[PDB]
């Protein structure tokens, strides 16, 4: 049967996307920029959580340091502005999930409960309820108003490197180090379906905006998953690229993946076609292992990628508006077939 | 004897545990309500006329110079 599928693949054509170039570089923090998150209501400013613990807010247009925020103690591993209500959630290895209010620039409510240094926060899009999960191997669910944990989605057998809150029945996509991913009947307190198509730490996951799917990463492979049924959608061509740290998808089906190699990958989300590799640069003084993109996100526009690299740099990427199907095409896509996943 | 951390205290057990019903300090209701969005003399001398390394920053060396003597 393989030959049929392969033939079908060859028949189809992954569309051309404009490639990328390093538009802006910001040596802002004094640590790794492990978290980056961008305001989805206005597309004006984006904050980034350092290892220093001082999450700093950055205007896009200028690029300048809008303002620092330092309520945490340990590395702010993740943050998440809620477009729904003006609350910047954040989270550190100090186990706090502090909710800032940007109408005041202070912190408002802490969410105590988490046993171990929480790695990720995701706010629920259609509720006043937020999801968080860390080394505890538990994806908790906080009612914001009342600042209690409502429910605790036990299941995972190992730390839980990412999480994504969606509006549907599978309200949580929990991506763990346990070489799994879970979709949850949140109301039930049960994994509705559990995809496991990963050899290694599933340590970079992203919801697609207008598709209702979620890409996940392993050490190399980068599946993309359709979370209605709880079904696979598409294997990718990530066969030689590094350990994926972050995996932010664009609005226009332009799935990003960030390498521990340092190499910025770039995929057509629909197909899997690796339509640009880009070996990143480090700052003059750095060491060659340090060039590692540890964070990433796209704007509302989708025309600016922001990447929290370990060179203490917040690099930003434009799509080339001078590009065509002849002036910089993709990397001449070819499904390899060598006992492959495609 | 005394050993590094490997497999964290997983909140599976804490979930299956019974409630305590204590009243902690911070779980007292703070900020009840939520916000929302809208939606001649000078001749006679001998001589008459960024890096990303925290250990090699100009600030750092200078600092050390200041705080040693």
């Amino acid at each position: 049967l393989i030959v049929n599928r392969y033939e079908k693949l060859l028949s189809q054509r992954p569309e051309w996307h404009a490639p990328w170039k390093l538009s802006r570089v910001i040596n802002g923090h004094l640590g790794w920029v492990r978290c980056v998150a961008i305001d989805p209501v206005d597309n004006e400013w984006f904050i980034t959580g350092s290892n220093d613990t001082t999450m700093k807010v950055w205007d896009l247009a200028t690029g300048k340091l809008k303002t620092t925020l330092a309520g945490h103690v340990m590395t702010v591993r993740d943050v998440a502005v809620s477009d729904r209500h003006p609350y910047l959630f954040s989270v550190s290895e100090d186990k706090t999930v502090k909710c800032w209010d940007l109408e005041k620039n202070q912190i408002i409510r802490d969410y105590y409960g988490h046993l171990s240094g929480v790695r990720t926060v995701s706010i629920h899009p259609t509720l006043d309820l937020i999801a968080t999960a860390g080394r505890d191997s538990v994806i908790k669910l906080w009612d914001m108003r009342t600042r209690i944990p409502v429910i605790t989605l036990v299941g995972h057998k190992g730390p839980i490197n990412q999480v994504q809150c969606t509006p549907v029945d599978p309200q949580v996509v929990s991506s763990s180090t346990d070489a799994t991913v879970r979709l949850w009947d949140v109301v039930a307190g049960k994994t509705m379906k559990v995809l496991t198509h990963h050899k290694r730490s599933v340590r970079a996951t992203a919801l697609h905006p207008k598709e209702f799917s979620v890409a996940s990463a392993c050490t190399d492979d980068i599946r993309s998953w359709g979370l209605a049924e709880g079904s696979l959608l598409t294997n990718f061509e990530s066969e030689k690229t590094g350990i994926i740290n972050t995996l932010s998808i664009n609005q226009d089906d332009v799935l990003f993946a960030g390498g521990d190699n340092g190499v910025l990958s770039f995929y057509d989300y629909k197909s899997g076609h690796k339509y640009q590799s880009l070996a990143t640069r480090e700052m003059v003084g750095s060491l060659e292992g340090e060039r590692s993109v540890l964070c990433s996100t796209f704007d509302k526009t989708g025309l600016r990628l922001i990447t929290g690299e370990a060179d203490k740099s917040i690099k930003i990427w434009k799509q080339d508006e001078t590009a065509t199907k002849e002036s910089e095409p993709g990397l001449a896509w070819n499904p390899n077939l060598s006992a492959k996943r495609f | 004897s005394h050993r590094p951390q490997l497999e964290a205290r997983s909140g599976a057990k804490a979930a299956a545990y019974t409630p305590t019903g204590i009243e902690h300090a911070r779980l007292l209701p703070g900020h009840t309500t939520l916000k929302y969005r809208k939606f001649s003399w000078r001749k006679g001398t001998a001589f008459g006329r960024y890096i990303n390394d925290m250990t090699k920053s100009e600030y750092h060396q200078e600092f050390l110079h200041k705080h040693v003597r």
């Binding site: 040596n27 802002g28 690029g63 340091l65 303002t67 620092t68 109408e103 | -």
Partner: peptide, 29 residues
């Protein structure tokens, strides 16, 4: 990189001095 179209910025201080909010309180007049 002093030559290239990559525009580097070694920022330090805040523009808005932790008073000017990041989002503004919408209201009646």
């Amino acid at each position: 990189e002093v030559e290239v179209l990559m525009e580097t910025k070694n920022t330090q201080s805040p523009q808005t001095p932790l008073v000017e909010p990041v989002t503004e309180r919408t209201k009646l007049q």
